[PDB]
mmCIF file of C-alpha atoms and ligand atoms in Angstrom:
data_model
loop_
_atom_site.group_PDB
_atom_site.id
_atom_site.type_symbol
_atom_site.label_atom_id
_atom_site.label_comp_id
_atom_site.label_asym_id
_atom_site.label_seq_id
_atom_site.Cartn_x
_atom_site.Cartn_y
_atom_site.Cartn_z
ATOM 1 C CA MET P 1 0.000 0.000 0.000
ATOM 2 C CA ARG P 2 1.340 3.422 -0.986
ATOM 3 C CA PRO P 3 1.540 6.183 1.617
ATOM 4 C CA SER P 4 -0.720 9.180 1.567
ATOM 5 C CA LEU P 5 0.774 12.479 0.476
ATOM 6 C CA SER P 6 -0.452 13.787 3.851
ATOM 7 C CA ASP P 7 2.163 11.536 5.500
ATOM 8 C CA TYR P 8 4.914 13.777 4.145
ATOM 9 C CA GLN P 9 5.850 17.348 5.057
ATOM 10 C CA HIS P 10 5.360 20.018 2.422
ATOM 11 C CA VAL P 11 8.549 22.061 2.306
ATOM 12 C CA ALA P 12 8.292 24.104 -0.905
ATOM 13 C CA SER P 13 5.946 25.182 -3.689
ATOM 14 C CA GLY P 14 6.628 26.629 -7.119
ATOM 15 C CA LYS P 15 4.257 27.858 -9.808
ATOM 16 C CA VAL P 16 3.544 24.370 -11.119
ATOM 17 C CA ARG P 17 5.494 22.065 -8.806
ATOM 18 C CA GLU P 18 5.620 21.014 -5.138
ATOM 19 C CA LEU P 19 8.319 19.589 -2.891
ATOM 20 C CA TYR P 20 7.847 17.277 0.112
ATOM 21 C CA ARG P 21 10.098 15.807 2.794
ATOM 22 C CA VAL P 22 10.006 12.004 2.846
ATOM 23 C CA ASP P 23 12.703 11.445 5.456
ATOM 24 C CA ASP P 24 16.021 12.960 6.558
ATOM 25 C CA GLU P 25 17.707 12.123 3.267
ATOM 26 C CA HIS P 26 14.890 12.016 0.694
ATOM 27 C CA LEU P 27 12.323 14.316 -0.873
ATOM 28 C CA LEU P 28 9.313 13.871 -3.130
ATOM 29 C CA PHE P 29 9.429 16.101 -6.201
ATOM 30 C CA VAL P 30 5.905 16.679 -7.527
ATOM 31 C CA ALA P 31 4.869 18.071 -10.932
ATOM 32 C CA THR P 32 1.341 19.460 -11.076
ATOM 33 C CA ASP P 33 -1.063 19.831 -13.984
ATOM 34 C CA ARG P 34 -0.998 23.623 -13.666
ATOM 35 C CA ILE P 35 0.309 25.703 -16.564
ATOM 36 C CA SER P 36 1.789 29.191 -16.614
ATOM 37 C CA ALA P 37 1.396 31.750 -19.385
ATOM 38 C CA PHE P 38 2.455 35.412 -19.340
ATOM 39 C CA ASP P 39 3.692 34.974 -15.743
ATOM 40 C CA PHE P 40 0.239 33.898 -14.572
ATOM 41 C CA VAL P 41 -0.635 30.440 -13.311
ATOM 42 C CA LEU P 42 -3.793 29.773 -15.312
ATOM 43 C CA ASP P 43 -7.083 28.720 -13.766
ATOM 44 C CA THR P 44 -7.368 25.685 -16.029
ATOM 45 C CA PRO P 45 -5.111 22.674 -15.479
ATOM 46 C CA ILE P 46 -3.804 20.687 -18.443
ATOM 47 C CA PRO P 47 -4.788 17.019 -18.071
ATOM 48 C CA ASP P 48 -1.773 14.671 -17.625
ATOM 49 C CA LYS P 49 0.698 17.574 -17.852
ATOM 50 C CA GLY P 50 2.413 16.609 -14.590
ATOM 51 C CA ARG P 51 2.799 13.007 -15.767
ATOM 52 C CA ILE P 52 3.993 13.915 -19.260
ATOM 53 C CA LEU P 53 6.642 16.319 -17.968
ATOM 54 C CA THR P 54 7.812 13.822 -15.343
ATOM 55 C CA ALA P 55 8.119 11.199 -18.088
ATOM 56 C CA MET P 56 10.116 13.729 -20.131
ATOM 57 C CA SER P 57 12.448 14.529 -17.286
ATOM 58 C CA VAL P 58 13.012 10.827 -16.500
ATOM 59 C CA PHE P 59 13.888 10.186 -20.142
ATOM 60 C CA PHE P 60 16.439 13.012 -20.207
ATOM 61 C CA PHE P 61 18.002 11.994 -16.852
ATOM 62 C CA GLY P 62 18.540 8.581 -18.466
ATOM 63 C CA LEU P 63 20.040 10.111 -21.604
ATOM 64 C CA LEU P 64 22.565 12.211 -19.707
ATOM 65 C CA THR P 65 25.604 10.609 -18.104
ATOM 66 C CA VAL P 66 25.878 13.060 -15.207
ATOM 67 C CA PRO P 67 24.960 12.289 -11.565
ATOM 68 C CA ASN P 68 21.367 13.201 -10.741
ATOM 69 C CA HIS P 69 19.182 13.261 -7.677
ATOM 70 C CA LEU P 70 16.803 10.413 -8.578
ATOM 71 C CA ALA P 71 16.661 7.969 -5.658
ATOM 72 C CA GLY P 72 14.196 5.374 -6.914
ATOM 73 C CA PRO P 73 12.104 4.153 -9.869
ATOM 74 C CA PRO P 74 8.980 5.979 -11.111
ATOM 75 C CA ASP P 75 6.851 3.365 -9.323
ATOM 76 C CA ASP P 76 8.799 3.463 -6.022
ATOM 77 C CA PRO P 77 6.425 2.391 -3.210
ATOM 78 C CA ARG P 78 7.183 5.627 -1.324
ATOM 79 C CA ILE P 79 5.251 7.544 -3.996
ATOM 80 C CA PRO P 80 1.562 8.199 -3.133
ATOM 81 C CA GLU P 81 -1.108 6.941 -5.529
ATOM 82 C CA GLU P 82 -2.460 10.459 -5.949
ATOM 83 C CA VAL P 83 0.772 11.683 -7.565
ATOM 84 C CA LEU P 84 1.837 8.447 -9.247
ATOM 85 C CA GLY P 85 3.492 9.191 -12.579
ATOM 86 C CA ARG P 86 4.047 12.854 -11.753
ATOM 87 C CA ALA P 87 6.290 12.528 -8.707
ATOM 88 C CA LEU P 88 9.843 11.283 -8.137
ATOM 89 C CA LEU P 89 11.701 10.141 -5.038
ATOM 90 C CA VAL P 90 14.940 12.136 -4.876
ATOM 91 C CA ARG P 91 17.958 12.375 -2.583
ATOM 92 C CA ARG P 92 18.387 15.478 -0.449
ATOM 93 C CA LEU P 93 21.255 17.711 -1.586
ATOM 94 C CA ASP P 94 22.843 20.957 -0.476
ATOM 95 C CA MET P 95 21.475 23.128 -3.278
ATOM 96 C CA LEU P 96 23.643 25.704 -5.037
ATOM 97 C CA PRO P 97 21.991 29.164 -5.247
ATOM 98 C CA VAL P 98 22.410 29.516 -9.021
ATOM 99 C CA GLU P 99 19.907 29.161 -11.835
ATOM 100 C CA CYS P 100 22.107 27.503 -14.424
ATOM 101 C CA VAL P 101 20.923 28.555 -17.865
ATOM 102 C CA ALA P 102 22.219 27.552 -21.262
ATOM 103 C CA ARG P 103 21.084 29.412 -24.393
ATOM 104 C CA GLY P 104 21.567 27.954 -27.840
ATOM 105 C CA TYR P 105 19.434 30.721 -29.355
ATOM 106 C CA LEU P 106 18.960 34.396 -28.559
ATOM 107 C CA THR P 107 15.472 35.217 -27.213
ATOM 108 C CA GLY P 108 13.765 36.477 -24.069
ATOM 109 C CA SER P 109 15.859 38.309 -21.522
ATOM 110 C CA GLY P 110 19.026 37.157 -23.327
ATOM 111 C CA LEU P 111 17.938 38.981 -26.463
ATOM 112 C CA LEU P 112 16.823 42.010 -24.443
ATOM 113 C CA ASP P 113 20.136 42.244 -22.616
ATOM 114 C CA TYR P 114 21.953 41.984 -25.962
ATOM 115 C CA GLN P 115 19.807 44.703 -27.547
ATOM 116 C CA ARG P 116 20.467 46.985 -24.602
ATOM 117 C CA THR P 117 24.188 46.365 -24.071
ATOM 118 C CA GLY P 118 25.606 44.133 -26.793
ATOM 119 C CA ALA P 119 26.313 41.517 -24.129
ATOM 120 C CA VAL P 120 24.531 38.786 -22.152
ATOM 121 C CA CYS P 121 25.714 37.689 -18.662
ATOM 122 C CA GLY P 122 29.199 38.966 -19.424
ATOM 123 C CA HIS P 123 29.388 37.557 -22.945
ATOM 124 C CA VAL P 124 30.088 40.212 -25.553
ATOM 125 C CA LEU P 125 28.445 38.902 -28.708
ATOM 126 C CA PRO P 126 28.891 39.613 -32.417
ATOM 127 C CA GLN P 127 26.946 42.555 -33.871
ATOM 128 C CA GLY P 128 23.936 41.863 -36.068
ATOM 129 C CA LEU P 129 22.137 39.194 -34.031
ATOM 130 C CA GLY P 130 18.404 39.275 -33.459
ATOM 131 C CA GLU P 131 15.322 37.361 -32.363
ATOM 132 C CA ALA P 132 15.903 33.582 -32.386
ATOM 133 C CA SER P 133 19.465 33.947 -33.745
ATOM 134 C CA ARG P 134 21.535 30.788 -33.285
ATOM 135 C CA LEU P 135 24.338 31.099 -30.717
ATOM 136 C CA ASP P 136 27.419 28.971 -31.366
ATOM 137 C CA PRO P 137 28.780 27.927 -28.992
ATOM 138 C CA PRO P 138 25.837 27.941 -26.562
ATOM 139 C CA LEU P 139 26.099 30.558 -23.797
ATOM 140 C CA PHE P 140 26.144 30.009 -20.046
ATOM 141 C CA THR P 141 23.778 32.757 -18.893
ATOM 142 C CA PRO P 142 23.336 32.247 -15.138
ATOM 143 C CA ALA P 143 20.639 33.895 -13.068
ATOM 144 C CA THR P 144 19.645 34.343 -9.434
ATOM 145 C CA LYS P 145 16.150 34.038 -7.983
ATOM 146 C CA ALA P 146 14.464 37.268 -6.868
ATOM 147 C CA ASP P 147 11.304 37.965 -4.830
ATOM 148 C CA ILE P 148 8.176 35.844 -5.404
ATOM 149 C CA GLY P 149 6.626 38.028 -8.097
ATOM 150 C CA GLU P 150 9.806 38.893 -9.950
ATOM 151 C CA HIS P 151 11.721 37.323 -12.829
ATOM 152 C CA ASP P 152 15.137 35.805 -12.161
ATOM 153 C CA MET P 153 18.034 38.266 -12.345
ATOM 154 C CA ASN P 154 20.647 37.658 -15.058
ATOM 155 C CA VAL P 155 24.192 37.714 -13.691
ATOM 156 C CA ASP P 156 27.694 37.214 -15.061
ATOM 157 C CA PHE P 157 30.296 34.561 -14.317
ATOM 158 C CA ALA P 158 31.937 36.704 -11.601
ATOM 159 C CA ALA P 159 28.641 36.670 -9.719
ATOM 160 C CA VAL P 160 28.546 32.899 -9.924
ATOM 161 C CA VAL P 161 32.102 32.732 -8.580
ATOM 162 C CA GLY P 162 30.996 34.950 -5.697
ATOM 163 C CA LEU P 163 28.118 32.602 -4.935
ATOM 164 C CA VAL P 164 29.723 29.163 -5.097
ATOM 165 C CA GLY P 165 33.503 29.545 -5.448
ATOM 166 C CA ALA P 166 35.846 29.845 -8.426
ATOM 167 C CA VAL P 167 36.412 26.144 -9.128
ATOM 168 C CA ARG P 168 32.745 25.247 -8.557
ATOM 169 C CA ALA P 169 31.645 28.079 -10.857
ATOM 170 C CA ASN P 170 33.830 26.670 -13.649
ATOM 171 C CA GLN P 171 32.271 23.280 -13.027
ATOM 172 C CA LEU P 172 28.718 24.669 -13.198
ATOM 173 C CA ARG P 173 29.515 26.450 -16.444
ATOM 174 C CA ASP P 174 31.149 23.433 -18.058
ATOM 175 C CA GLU P 175 28.520 20.873 -17.041
ATOM 176 C CA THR P 176 25.593 23.206 -17.954
ATOM 177 C CA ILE P 177 26.906 23.686 -21.483
ATOM 178 C CA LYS P 178 27.860 20.010 -21.891
ATOM 179 C CA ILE P 179 24.483 18.583 -20.923
ATOM 180 C CA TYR P 180 22.556 21.284 -22.823
ATOM 181 C CA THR P 181 24.609 20.484 -25.948
ATOM 182 C CA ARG P 182 23.847 16.754 -25.636
ATOM 183 C CA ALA P 183 20.121 17.178 -25.028
ATOM 184 C CA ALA P 184 19.725 19.869 -27.706
ATOM 185 C CA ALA P 185 21.411 17.740 -30.375
ATOM 186 C CA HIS P 186 19.197 14.761 -29.456
ATOM 187 C CA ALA P 187 16.015 16.809 -29.566
ATOM 188 C CA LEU P 188 16.924 18.424 -32.898
ATOM 189 C CA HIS P 189 17.549 14.986 -34.362
ATOM 190 C CA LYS P 190 13.916 14.278 -33.464
ATOM 191 C CA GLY P 191 12.632 17.555 -34.932
ATOM 192 C CA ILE P 192 12.489 19.751 -31.826
ATOM 193 C CA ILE P 193 14.802 22.641 -30.995
ATOM 194 C CA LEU P 194 15.586 23.126 -27.317
ATOM 195 C CA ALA P 195 16.360 26.820 -27.577
ATOM 196 C CA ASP P 196 17.503 27.188 -23.990
ATOM 197 C CA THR P 197 17.210 25.446 -20.651
ATOM 198 C CA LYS P 198 17.425 26.101 -16.892
ATOM 199 C CA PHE P 199 18.969 23.719 -14.277
ATOM 200 C CA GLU P 200 19.596 23.717 -10.575
ATOM 201 C CA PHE P 201 22.435 21.655 -9.088
ATOM 202 C CA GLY P 202 23.153 20.482 -5.569
ATOM 203 C CA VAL P 203 26.094 18.895 -3.787
ATOM 204 C CA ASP P 204 26.014 15.502 -2.051
ATOM 205 C CA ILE P 205 27.887 14.444 1.107
ATOM 206 C CA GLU P 206 31.065 13.672 -0.860
ATOM 207 C CA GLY P 207 31.113 17.092 -2.497
ATOM 208 C CA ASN P 208 29.957 15.771 -5.872
ATOM 209 C CA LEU P 209 27.899 17.957 -8.203
ATOM 210 C CA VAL P 210 24.422 16.513 -8.772
ATOM 211 C CA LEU P 211 21.740 17.609 -11.247
ATOM 212 C CA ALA P 212 18.391 18.182 -9.535
ATOM 213 C CA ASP P 213 14.775 19.365 -10.086
ATOM 214 C CA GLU P 214 13.239 18.680 -13.482
ATOM 215 C CA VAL P 215 15.307 18.658 -16.625
ATOM 216 C CA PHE P 216 14.543 19.615 -20.222
ATOM 217 C CA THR P 217 10.796 19.964 -19.780
ATOM 218 C CA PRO P 218 8.853 22.586 -21.748
ATOM 219 C CA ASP P 219 8.533 24.451 -18.446
ATOM 220 C CA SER P 220 12.329 24.547 -17.905
ATOM 221 C CA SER P 221 13.222 24.920 -21.586
ATOM 222 C CA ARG P 222 11.856 26.618 -24.702
ATOM 223 C CA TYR P 223 10.645 23.912 -27.098
ATOM 224 C CA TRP P 224 10.411 24.983 -30.757
ATOM 225 C CA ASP P 225 9.329 23.059 -33.856
ATOM 226 C CA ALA P 226 12.524 22.658 -35.865
ATOM 227 C CA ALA P 227 10.569 22.321 -39.105
ATOM 228 C CA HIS P 228 9.380 25.914 -38.692
ATOM 229 C CA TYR P 229 12.522 27.500 -37.312
ATOM 230 C CA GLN P 230 12.874 30.954 -38.895
ATOM 231 C CA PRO P 231 15.539 33.287 -37.485
ATOM 232 C CA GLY P 232 14.414 36.885 -37.118
ATOM 233 C CA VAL P 233 10.874 36.369 -35.825
ATOM 234 C CA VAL P 234 9.460 35.074 -32.532
ATOM 235 C CA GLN P 235 9.189 31.266 -32.606
ATOM 236 C CA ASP P 236 5.964 29.545 -31.647
ATOM 237 C CA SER P 237 6.018 27.781 -28.303
ATOM 238 C CA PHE P 238 5.702 24.096 -29.202
ATOM 239 C CA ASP P 239 3.593 23.423 -26.121
ATOM 240 C CA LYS P 240 1.945 26.720 -25.182
ATOM 241 C CA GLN P 241 1.127 28.568 -28.394
ATOM 242 C CA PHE P 242 -2.560 27.502 -28.454
ATOM 243 C CA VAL P 243 -2.949 28.824 -24.898
ATOM 244 C CA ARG P 244 -1.081 32.012 -25.791
ATOM 245 C CA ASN P 245 -3.081 32.629 -28.941
ATOM 246 C CA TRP P 246 -6.450 32.089 -27.302
ATOM 247 C CA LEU P 247 -5.704 34.322 -24.315
ATOM 248 C CA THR P 248 -4.517 37.184 -26.508
ATOM 249 C CA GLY P 249 -7.162 36.577 -29.165
ATOM 250 C CA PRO P 250 -10.657 38.024 -29.685
ATOM 251 C CA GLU P 251 -12.507 35.250 -27.801
ATOM 252 C CA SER P 252 -10.893 35.513 -24.361
ATOM 253 C CA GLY P 253 -12.132 38.975 -23.430
ATOM 254 C CA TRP P 254 -8.791 39.503 -21.707
ATOM 255 C CA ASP P 255 -6.304 42.334 -22.119
ATOM 256 C CA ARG P 256 -2.770 41.052 -21.469
ATOM 257 C CA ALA P 257 -1.590 44.582 -20.668
ATOM 258 C CA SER P 258 -4.147 44.752 -17.844
ATOM 259 C CA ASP P 259 -1.879 42.603 -15.640
ATOM 260 C CA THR P 260 -5.155 41.256 -14.259
ATOM 261 C CA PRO P 261 -5.439 37.468 -13.841
ATOM 262 C CA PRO P 262 -6.421 35.856 -17.166
ATOM 263 C CA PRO P 263 -9.699 33.933 -17.588
ATOM 264 C CA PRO P 264 -10.041 30.125 -17.659
ATOM 265 C CA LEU P 265 -9.187 28.299 -20.869
ATOM 266 C CA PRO P 266 -11.591 26.507 -23.171
ATOM 267 C CA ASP P 267 -11.661 22.761 -22.481
ATOM 268 C CA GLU P 268 -10.746 22.250 -26.139
ATOM 269 C CA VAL P 269 -7.581 24.351 -25.725
ATOM 270 C CA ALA P 270 -6.558 22.347 -22.635
ATOM 271 C CA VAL P 271 -7.073 19.061 -24.509
ATOM 272 C CA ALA P 272 -5.130 20.323 -27.545
ATOM 273 C CA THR P 273 -2.325 21.432 -25.244
ATOM 274 C CA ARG P 274 -2.156 17.980 -23.671
ATOM 275 C CA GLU P 275 -1.812 16.517 -27.164
ATOM 276 C CA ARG P 276 1.152 18.824 -27.855
ATOM 277 C CA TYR P 277 2.897 17.662 -24.669
ATOM 278 C CA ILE P 278 2.395 14.027 -25.645
ATOM 279 C CA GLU P 279 3.649 14.695 -29.181
ATOM 280 C CA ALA P 280 6.798 16.353 -27.849
ATOM 281 C CA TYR P 281 7.416 13.559 -25.353
ATOM 282 C CA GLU P 282 6.919 10.729 -27.821
ATOM 283 C CA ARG P 283 9.028 12.385 -30.509
ATOM 284 C CA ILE P 284 11.953 13.054 -28.187
ATOM 285 C CA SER P 285 11.849 9.827 -26.158
ATOM 286 C CA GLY P 286 10.854 7.355 -28.864
ATOM 287 C CA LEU P 287 8.484 5.934 -26.256
ATOM 288 C CA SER P 288 4.694 5.835 -25.900
ATOM 289 C CA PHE P 289 3.065 7.931 -23.205
ATOM 290 C CA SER P 290 0.380 5.247 -22.974
ATOM 291 C CA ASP P 291 3.051 3.117 -21.255
ATOM 292 C CA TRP P 292 3.874 5.725 -18.610
ATOM 293 C CA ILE P 293 2.712 4.918 -15.093
ATOM 294 C CA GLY P 294 -0.335 6.609 -13.585
ATOM 295 C CA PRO P 295 -3.113 6.301 -10.976
HETATM 296 N N1 Q0H C 1 15.061 18.996 -6.600
HETATM 297 C C1 Q0H C 1 15.550 19.103 -5.569
HETATM 298 C C2 Q0H C 1 16.222 19.231 -4.165
HETATM 299 C C3 Q0H C 1 17.016 18.162 -3.668
HETATM 300 N N2 Q0H C 1 17.191 16.988 -4.415
HETATM 301 N N3 Q0H C 1 17.578 18.284 -2.441
HETATM 302 C C4 Q0H C 1 17.429 19.391 -1.723
HETATM 303 N N4 Q0H C 1 16.692 20.415 -2.155
HETATM 304 C C5 Q0H C 1 16.093 20.395 -3.363
HETATM 305 C C6 Q0H C 1 15.283 21.648 -3.798
HETATM 306 C C7 Q0H C 1 14.855 22.659 -2.918
HETATM 307 N N5 Q0H C 1 14.219 23.606 -3.682
HETATM 308 N N6 Q0H C 1 14.267 23.198 -4.978
HETATM 309 C C8 Q0H C 1 13.677 23.930 -6.077
HETATM 310 C C9 Q0H C 1 12.161 23.605 -5.951
HETATM 311 C C10 Q0H C 1 11.654 22.391 -6.451
HETATM 312 C C11 Q0H C 1 10.303 22.097 -6.324
HETATM 313 C C12 Q0H C 1 9.466 23.016 -5.676
HETATM 314 F F1 Q0H C 1 8.143 22.760 -5.534
HETATM 315 C C13 Q0H C 1 9.974 24.212 -5.176
HETATM 316 F F2 Q0H C 1 9.164 25.084 -4.564
HETATM 317 C C14 Q0H C 1 11.328 24.507 -5.301
HETATM 318 C C15 Q0H C 1 14.925 22.015 -5.084
#
């Protein structure tokens, strides 16, 4: 019999994830079905989103050769029935206070920083780049978390050194670019561009660097359709563009500039969005989501 979630202590919540204490050395990492758009957590959950993204993350952990925080199988008996398929048993680490970001393409705050200063996180880039420009090699563009409502703050390598030490900072940079490069090449082979990605790392008892949280999900990474990649314009979000289009379209009744909470999504948009998550997962993993564990 699986334990109840209420047997564990809630220790953290994010926009679309939760974290629980299992015992002194283990946590339960939980993905929810909530979806964020335009910095709002939407009223409408996406069915199976937590399970699909957990399946995605498990696939990528398996693809990468680096140490990670997984501490048991996806069906580990310590996982409650209620979150089965969308929760992982992980080992407790001393987390490093750095959002480790790799960018293979120039968009978002990376693009904005470049347009303002000609540089991103200390990297002075060539002139003449623009929206969705390819970056070669990929850039380590670290960030720090700010207050609850605020976006992460982009910082340079010196700031990372100041946070975790000189040798550790080099390690974070090197590993972030190495595993991004591997995952991005794999995804592109399958027809999906991973334009960028965000990791957190922790340290175990022996001082080893360990990859944590969720990895290479559409929440942690921008997924683009490679078949429609067109430098110079904003790329469609592989997973969220239906949601985005409806909210900012003539049927929502919502003004994005209002900064007021957006309305609930049409059921049809939520179902279509679920289909996009499954498509992305099955294309990248080569597996069937129908085989992924659930309640
Ligand atoms: N993963 C992991 C982990 C670990 N293996 N050992 C120690 N601490 C962490 C840990 C602590 N915070 N976070 C970020 C995070 C995740 C999920 C949430 F819901 C959330 F609010 C905040 C990760």
